[PDB]
Design a binder for this molecule. Structure first.
Ligand SMILES: CCCCCCCCCCCCCC(=O)O
Length: 192
């Protein structure tokens, strides 16, 4: 699914524990990266610029329909591969196409059941987002939450620390769901 031969996403979740899950991927249609250029900055570490440098098959889009219907605020991600690597993981939160947060983290492979796992677990969600979410959930209507969320996106770049090569670049876009329907996601490939 979300993956190359070199690196695959296995789980991604953002949550609040008193455990509520805003989003959750547990583990394909195309989309033209040009469609979403204005949703991320034009600067260095910009989506157009990244996609230029390649490689094209490393770039994905997740659309999330999140659950704001509910503390410790955390982000748990887990990747896997067959090669032993050290990862640089860069998450950039963007608001109206401006980068407002960059979080840079590192994770060395751990051997388990004959593959290498990379566990970035219960990382504390930055306070920009915790505050943002507290506000967002005050809103009286879903359609108002989606309006606000049309201007909010996240870009995650995962690179081989030692070689500097891109392994994965994921663009995330957001709406809210009803609690009836629950959290949902749709993974796409980015093409050009
Ligand atoms: C609108 C619902 C958004 C909730 C999900 C959060 C998105 C994933 C977290 C991005 C990476 C963490 C960034 C950081 O807090 O430093």
């Amino acid at each position: 699914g979300l993956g190359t031969a070199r690196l695959q996403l296995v789980e991604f979740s953002a949550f609040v524990e008193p455990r509520h899950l805003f989003v959750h991927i547990s583990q394909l249609e195309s989309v033209d990266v040009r469609q979403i250029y204005d949703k991320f900055p034009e600067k260095k570490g910009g989506l157009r610029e990244l996609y230029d440098r390649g490689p094209p098959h490393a770039f994905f889009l997740v659309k999330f329909w999140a659950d704001l219907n509910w503390g410790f605020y955390g982000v748990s991600s887990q990747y896997e591969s067959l090669e032993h690597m050290t990862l640089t993981c860069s998450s950039k939160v963007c608001s109206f196409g401006k980068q407002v947060v960059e979080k840079v983290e590192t994770e060395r492979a751990q051997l388990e059941d004959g593959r290498f796992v990379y566990r970035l677990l219960r990382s504390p969600m930055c306070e920009y987002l915790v505050n943002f979410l507290h506000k967002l959930r005050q809103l009286p209507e879903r359609y108002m939450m989606n309006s606000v969320l049309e201007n909010f996106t996240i870009l995650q770049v995962v690179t081989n620390r030692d070689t500097q090569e891109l392994l994965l670049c994921t663009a995330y876009v957001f709406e809210v769901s009803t609690s009836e329907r629950g959290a949902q996601h749709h993974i796409y490939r980015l093409v050009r």
